Every structure is written in C-alpha cells, then in structure tokens.
Design a binder for this molecule. Structure first.
Ligand SMILES: Cc1ccc2nc(Cn3nc(C(F)(F)F)cc3Cl)cc(=O)n2c1[C@@H]1C[C@H]1C#N
Ligand SMILES: N[C@@H](CCC(=O)O)C(=O)O
Lengths: 279, 275
C-alpha cells in the first residue's frame, strides 16, 4: 500500500547538494530563511563494478526546493533516492539500453527525475519532459591562465595528447558530441578522457589533470563564481533546457508543466535562481 | 496531412508582403480575409507572402514532420486574449478548431496552456523594459514602476495591451497595471516613436521583440535594462489542439533542429543586430 512517488536525483551543485546525515539520521539545520532538506538514500561507494550499499543522506538545492514546491502544488507524497550508477543517462548498445536516471525511470525504479537533466531529442523519444524550468547552454571550464576562443578554437578542433579536454560519461554533452559529425574529431579525443562525474572533472581541472571541461553553463558559471582558480571561456553553444522527466503514461505530466509555468510567471523560479545560483 | 495554420505579423518572426503574380524567394503564401465594408460580414481572402524566423521554422517542420499547409493570418484579435472565458487571436483559432496549429511570436503561458497544447519553447522570451540609454531603472521591481506616484513628475510607462505582458502585469503588479493603462500603446512602432520623442519613459514588452528592436535601433539610443534582462522568462511555442497527434513529432523535430545547429543558423540569419 503506497501511492508515494519515487524521485530520482543526482549530485550536482548548486541544484542538488548531497551531504551525510547527523549521528541520529537527521539533517544539519542550515539557513539561507531555513534551508529545506530531504532524506535521500544512495550508494556510499563510488567506483565502477563495485557493490552499492544504500545509505540515507541529506539532499538540498534548487531542484529540491523545486520538488517540494511541486509536491505541495499537486498534492503528492514522495521519497527521494540518488541514481545508483551516478549518471544522467545515455542509450548504449548491449539491443539498446538506457543507463543512469533515464534507465531508472524507464524501469519503474523511479517515477520522476528531478535534477538539472537536459531536454534532448534522444531522451524525448522515450520519456516525457516537462516545460523547462531553466534555459542554459554549454561552456568550457579552464584554469585561470588558459586561453581558448570557444568551440571553434584550434586546440580543440585539432586535438593532441598535449591539451586534454573532456566531459562527463553517459551525459547529454556526450550525446551532443556523438550525434554531430562536425564534432566527431572532438568526440574521439573526449571519449578517452571523460570522467564518471562533473565534481571529479572539476577537481581534475584544479589538479592540472584536465585542461578544459565542456559542461552545462548553469553549473560551470556557478563553479567559477566560487572557485576563483577556475574560469569559464567562450560563449554558449547547444543552448538547451533543464526539465522534469516522467514516463509518457504519467498522469502528472500536464500538472507538472502548469506548476513550472506558474513558478516562472510569479517569480518563484527567479527566487530559486537568486537563492542558489547568482571573483 | 494538409493542415490549416494561423499566423500573425510581428517582425522579425512573421513578415507579410504583397504578391509579385505568385510568392517569390524565401516567402510562403499566406491569406488574409479582408472585409468588403464595415456594414457586412462579406469579405475576401487576399493573397499575401510570409517570411521571417517562425516561417523558416514552419518550412523545416513541414519537410521534417511531412505535412502540407494552408497558412492564414488571424483577423479576430492578435496573439490571444480570453474575454468572458472566450479566446480570440491565434489561441482562439486553435481553441475553436479553425486552425490545426498557430505559428508565430506566441508566448507560452499557464492560462493559454489550459486550452491549447504548446510545443517545446523555441525562442526565449518574457518581459523586458526598453528605455532611452541612461534611464536609471533597476527593472520591473523598481519603485518607479511599483509606486509611480512617489515621483514628481511620475514615470510614464506602458505596454501594448491584450497580450501575455499585460496579463502578467495584471496578475503580479496590480497597482502598476491600473496606473499603466493610460500609457497603453496601439503597437510596437507607436511605442518606440513615443519613447524617441519624449512622450514615454519606458516601454514594457515581449523580450525577444524588444531585444531585436534595440539591436536594430538607429543610433542605438533605445536599450533594454540590464544586459537585455528577462522577467517572467518563458518562450515562443507552436500552439496545437489539446491532445494533438502532431505535438510529439513537432517537439522531436525542434529538439533535432537544436542538436544539428539549425536553430543557431536561424538566430544568426534573423535575430542578430548592430547594437
Ligand atoms: C531551443 C530553445 C530555445 C529557447 C528556449 N527558451 C526557453 C525559455 N523558457 N521557456 C519556458 C517555458 F516554460 F515557457 F516554455 C521556460 C523557459 Cl526558461 C527554454 C528552452 O528550453 N528553450 C530552448 C530549448 C530547446 C527547448 C526546450 N525544451
Ligand atoms: N508574444 C506576446 C505578444 C506581446 C506581448 O503582449 O508581450 C503574446 O504571445 O501575447
């Protein structure tokens, strides 16, 4: 007996902060106004091909504030968990299979995806995306001192083992560089250096391991505003939106979108942007 | 397969021209019903030519989604206004099934979404504020807009009513709205002239149109406050009948156009400016 919604999310600052619980299994009461926090069960152990031990964790950020607003608006009960494999989600050949939160949602392990999940053709062929709650693009994260003109820079268009540039494995950035033949040369360099997570990639730019990180501007711009040793370069390419993901059959699809439109019109979405996003 | 499509002129999205004796270059044929006189319902469909950003989008969706169309310009209202729970404009055309879809500078909003289905947004818009360069306003939240009579003389500002902008101001800023109605403008062109000739201080309007207008302003006098800042961000979408079988293929083709860099090609071709 349960008409409670299974919500899947991923660790992605500043949208989803993931921190451990206190010694009693509760969240450290923080303040912006109180910081609204949820219990999010997830694997404590990263690394591929390793056993995943589900532990309660604390979840907060732009997307959590958004979920709470969605639950209160549509009158739904929910429970939150982090994506077991730590990925956003691509369709790979095994017969083809979706991995990450995409795989999770399509199998019924999740009833909803609440994360900075990019709306794209490949995913929209299989799932329902709400109206976007954020419009953003792709940019490049370099170390303060590195110079690049953008996506048309010869250090990227003409790759070499000298300058290492990557993205996140099983992400939409991976889907974009793979689908486009005009970027096949760049995709061939990237495939060898792609990280399991954006945090790992961001740290690798801090530790001189990675020299350029092609990622979502909403995340890169936020990162550059905190970590002054890193800066974003060039304008925005593949301008895309972030949306809520549901199965095509979902009875919440029309109401999820109306709530998002409401929040854009009444300033709520601009509030989240001020609270969580905006050297 | 052969769809009735409604549009409305608004440059650079929809541009209407007179026929050459057919439609030339990048123009598609569009009809407009023109009344014989004002004391009859009798009229005739005049053959015209349509081009612009949204017309190129239609041409691409026609080819990709594999449909043919009969494009017409709305004559009852403009974009869409619900009067006594009865929609006019492009929205009304779709609601009352005279059009399978509406293509144009059509803003996605919550109340319109209740009566029509929208495609994914394909142009970022919302509310922007145009002023002569040097006007000290922080944006819609500025006390010059919020409490205009706290100023001697008061700030003179208006919008073109009956569209999504006035609806948003009516809903969010009740005092600002009732104050604004004396500065209502017949259209964009009138509004820009009033600004340029000191009859108006600020023009509150659709972000995408205002940014295009600022980018093409002669002498670059007129600007949008902030780096072309957008309040109540939303987008332009194709409006379709509730539960339309065309929505799916149309969303997929639009997201395909973004993936392939076809969107940026149109944005470069139609929307880039000097200023
Ligand atoms: C290509 C494109 C162009 C404009 C655009 N503008 C908004 C602006 N916008 N629009 C809304 C609205 F909810 F009204 F649709 C919310 C926001 Cl943010 C969101 C958005 O995602 N855009 C997109 C991506 C592909 C489409 C998708 N999905
Ligand atoms: N694009 C607007 C028209 C202009 C406006 O009222 O801001 C709409 O669809 O209503």
């Amino acid at each position: 007996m349960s008409t409670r919604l299974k919500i899947v999310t991923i660790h992605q600052e500043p949208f989803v902060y993931v921190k451990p619980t206190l010694s009693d299994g509760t969240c450290k009461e923080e303040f912006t106004d109180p910081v609204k926090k949820v219990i999010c069960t997830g694997p404590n152990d990263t690394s591929p091909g390793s056993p995943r031990h589900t532990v309660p964790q604390c979840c907060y950020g732009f997307c959590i504030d958004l979920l709470i607003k969605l639950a209160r608006t549509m009158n739904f009960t929910y429970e939150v968990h982090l994506v077991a494999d730590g990925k956003f989600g691509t369709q790979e050949r095994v017969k083809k299979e979706w991995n990450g939160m995409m795989g999770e949602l399509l199998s019924g392990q999740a009833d909803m995806i609440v994360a900075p999940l990019t709306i794209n053709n490949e995913r929209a062929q299989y799932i329902e995306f709400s109206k976007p709650f954020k419009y953003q693009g792709l940019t490049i994260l370099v170390k303060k001192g590195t110079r690049i003109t953008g996506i048309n820079d010869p250090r990227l268009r003409n790759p070499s083992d000298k300058f290492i540039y990557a993205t996140v494995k099983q992400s939409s950035v991976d889907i974009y560089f793979r689908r486009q033949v005009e970027l096949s040369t760049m995709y061939r360099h990237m495939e060898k250096h792609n990280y399991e997570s954006a945090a790992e990639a961001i740290q690798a730019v801090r530790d001189n391991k990675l020299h350029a990180f092609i990622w979502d501007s909403a995340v890169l711009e936020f990162e550059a505003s905190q970590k002054c040793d890193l800066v974003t370069t060039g304008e925005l390419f593949f301008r895309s939106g972030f949306g809520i993901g549901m199965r095509k059959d979902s009875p919440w699809k029309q109401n999820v979108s109306l709530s998002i439109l409401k929040s854009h019109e009444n300033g709520f979405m601009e509030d989240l942007d001020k609270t969580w996003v905006r050297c | 397969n052969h769809l009735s499509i409604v549009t409305l002129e608004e440059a650079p999205f929809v541009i209407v021209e007179d026929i050459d004796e057919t439609c030339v270059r990048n123009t598609v044929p569009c009809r407009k019903f023109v009344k014989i006189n004002n004391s009859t319902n009798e009229g005739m469909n005049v053959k015209k030519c349509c081009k612009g950003f949204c017309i190129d989008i239609l041409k691409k969706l026609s080819r990709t989604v594999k449909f043919t169309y009969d494009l017409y310009l709305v004559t009852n209202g403009k974009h869409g206004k619900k009067v006594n729970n009865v929609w006019n404009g492009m929205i009304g055309e779709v609601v009352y099934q005279r059009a399978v879809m509406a293509v144009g500078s059509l803003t996605i909003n919550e109340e319109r979404s209740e009566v029509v289905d929208f495609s994914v947004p394909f142009v970022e818009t919302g509310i922007s504020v145009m002023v002569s360069r040097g006007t000290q306003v922080t944006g819609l939240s500025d006390k010059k807009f919020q409490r205009p009579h706290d100023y001697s003389p008061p700030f003179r500002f208006g919008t073109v009513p009956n569209g999504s902008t006035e609806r948003n101001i009516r809903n969010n800023y009740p005092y600002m709205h009732q104050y604004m109605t004396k500065f209502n403008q017949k259209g964009v062109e009138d509004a820009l002239v009033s600004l340029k000739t000191g009859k108006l201080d600020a023009f509150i309007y659709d972000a995408a149109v205002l940014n295009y207008k600022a980018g093409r302003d002669e002498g670059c006098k007129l600007v949008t406050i902030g780096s072309g800042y957008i309040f109540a961000t939303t987008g332009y979408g194709i409006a379709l009948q509730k539960g339309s079988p065309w929505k799916r293929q149309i969303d997929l083709a639009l997201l395909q156009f973004v993936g392939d860099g076809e969107m940026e090609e149109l944005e470069t071709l139609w929307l880039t400016g000097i200023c």
